[PDB]
């Protein structure tokens, strides 16, 4: 007879307030694709328009979800991720999709295929406001491999809601997105009702069509390094030892390598009292720029903090350190660690070591298109596609904006 | 199917 | 037929990961007492031991809660607070108690009286682990003014749970805490299983008897010599509210609120008039006479302090500029972050920051004992028991067994030495 | 009821 704690729709906004850098939210979605339970080898991040709404999409070729798993994804605190074959999940908290999605936009939808079933999940602030829901309710529709519904009572109600309040008015509209996952397995996340300032999106898509950017009005709370304002630059350094390929705006992201990025590389070790094991550090002088230097702190192969100054905050420059600390704990937005005693010690050690180091030491990739078999029109393709079907038609186009034979061909780049 | 290639930018 | 989104117990820890500075969590509990729906005049923050567990307690003489409201309190996202008579609530998110309590400790209990009923609510990670709940369930027990149980099916179950896994193993143990709320109306929050490092709590209670402090290994992350507020709860509580409406008592000694007029010199006033607003924002600029070296901008939101000692303008630029210069501004137009220790980093925040620095620069170029403890004597045993500051009035006859303080509730317990 | 006072010592 004991009551369950309840979730109010308003909390959805509240849970997003930790992200003050939007890329933190983006990073979270990427992480979920990266994690070994999904095991995606590609993630495509795109900007498109659907039903007159600017949309951000995250599409991956990973394992997908059962319906129940979908529910957990749309629920708070459920995570069951284990290391596989030395692939360690970043995911811990069980909050990352909600916090990220909602930070990016009011409304989000998840289409997933696990190769036995496909499901569609709705997490909308807008929907909840309209129906004046007192609880967070997440519609789910599920289908067999044959496009036949299952779990009908849930599905019927869910579909009715989704069709009515969703971007996608028709069943036909929904399955198109399911179709945009080319493989048997995978997931597509669509987010709309993006944060707008000055009646325009927080993001700037105009300046570089191959990037998602933060407008000039840019630096973090903290001359800004690129990763601060370019998603592409950020994605490059996001993973220390990349296991997945990220495509932004259809152009794949070229990962940096320490070699060819740094000179006078030297190794160092951290042997805290509190730790069983040693932790390596790599110190380098920064080739590309100068102004960008500091420590790169990675946790579980993912980047938490970058360009953090240590030791000498002038004096000591162009110096970079790379360390991975799996013993620290990330904060709510995974952009910092908990400010513990151990964290403090690590920072201290890093500075001393860096100081020692200092004293001691002194063409984008080609686009690809396919021709439609029933227009003869050429339609643009994103990188990272291993296989095309024998014949390709505008109808099966993943890009929402050229799914019609009657859609004029895009000019190639001037 | 048929696939062109192109320069970017 | 659509499914409800679900809360997993593990989330309770997750929600607490915003707070990296323990005080931010404490602050949330204070705000909730401060807020006009509660309207507490006084809040008592204490360290005590119960059932062999160190505990932090937060007790107020505010309006209290109905059973349902208590449920919402133990629920995520429900807030319905409105300004009254110019008293503007801090809370809008609906997450602060959960985020705070859980940051401070694994388990928490809430006792409340609204003067028609009293109810008790349990929010424990430990309880949830032990019964392996897949969902977050919050047991609640509710009573009538006559100490009779009501809403029985829930209470009956709720109660059984509280006794078994709670600190308080008996109906009697529970009612004692309810008693510790002296007024007809009010609330008591008890938090236990506090965070421990080095097999000791993250907090240091022994260095100062009258304070809750963070031990030295202490500066905040942002900071580089540390002002008091960073390591002392009392120091922090002084500056917490711009125009205080409530009295905070820590460890039984009340907290005296700092005043600008008595704290700053060469006070000057400036105005912020940005294009995005229809109203002026006042600013106060002062020189810090007192510790030379805590200076910067204090930014207040809804009369509440969000960040302090933010360095702006020339102060940023070099070692030597702006030192001793303090600014006070309230920004109601900004939005606080998850832990309410910062604002959302938006074009508006950036602009405001820029203006403060320019304005601060202009200013800079332009210019150039503790209160007594009180004791009460037990009528039955004649022992003297220490009393916290802030009590408006006492009953005619007082006995060790009606003591709010948990540690001295029976006459059989030795009288405590005076200082 | 009866009440003393004392000095708190820093
Ligand atoms: N792209 C995806 N593909 C497959 N499964 C996913 C995907 N995104 C989320 N999930 C599932 O839904 C859950 C939600 O992810 P998230 O909300 O990030 O929680 P988490 O990754 O487990 N922990 P954290 O990320 O640390 O908050 C994950 O546990 C996954 O099981
Ligand atoms: N000491 C208290 N006395 C009475 N009611 C309380 C008390 N603390 C919390 N509540 C109720 O419980 C709710 C939860 O508080 P909290 O979790 O802080 O949410 P909030 O203050 O409404 N919003 P925020 O604090 O901004 O997250 C409040 O809205 C109050 O209605
Ligand atoms: Mg995740
Ligand atoms: Mg609050
Ligand atoms: Zn075609
Ligand atoms: Zn006595």
PDB file of C-alpha atoms in Angstrom, chain C residues 210 371-373 375-377 384 389 396, chain D:
ATOM      1  CA  UNK C 210      29.134  25.874  16.685  1.00  0.00           C
ATOM      2  CA  UNK C 371      25.956  35.245  21.688  1.00  0.00           C
ATOM      3  CA  UNK C 372      25.291  33.631  25.011  1.00  0.00           C
ATOM      4  CA  UNK C 373      24.160  30.083  25.429  1.00  0.00           C
ATOM      5  CA  UNK C 375      20.040  26.581  29.369  1.00  0.00           C
ATOM      6  CA  UNK C 376      16.887  25.267  30.876  1.00  0.00           C
ATOM      7  CA  UNK C 377      16.549  23.293  34.073  1.00  0.00           C
ATOM      8  CA  UNK C 384      20.702  21.728  33.222  1.00  0.00           C
ATOM      9  CA  UNK C 389      18.932  30.077  20.286  1.00  0.00           C
ATOM     10  CA  UNK C 396       5.944  26.609  32.070  1.00  0.00           C
TER      11      UNK C 396
ATOM     12  CA  UNK D   1      10.754  27.725  33.388  1.00  0.00           C
ATOM     13  CA  UNK D   2      14.180  28.310  34.782  1.00  0.00           C
ATOM     14  CA  UNK D   3      16.883  29.456  32.408  1.00  0.00           C
ATOM     15  CA  UNK D   4      20.568  30.174  32.777  1.00  0.00           C
ATOM     16  CA  UNK D   5      22.878  31.852  30.332  1.00  0.00           C
ATOM     17  CA  UNK D   6      26.472  31.159  29.601  1.00  0.00           C
ATOM     18  CA  UNK D   7      29.249  32.369  27.439  1.00  0.00           C
ATOM     19  CA  UNK D   8      30.057  30.379  24.353  1.00  0.00           C
ATOM     20  CA  UNK D   9      33.774  30.156  23.770  1.00  0.00           C
ATOM     21  CA  UNK D  10      35.336  30.395  20.353  1.00  0.00           C
TER      22      UNK D  10
END
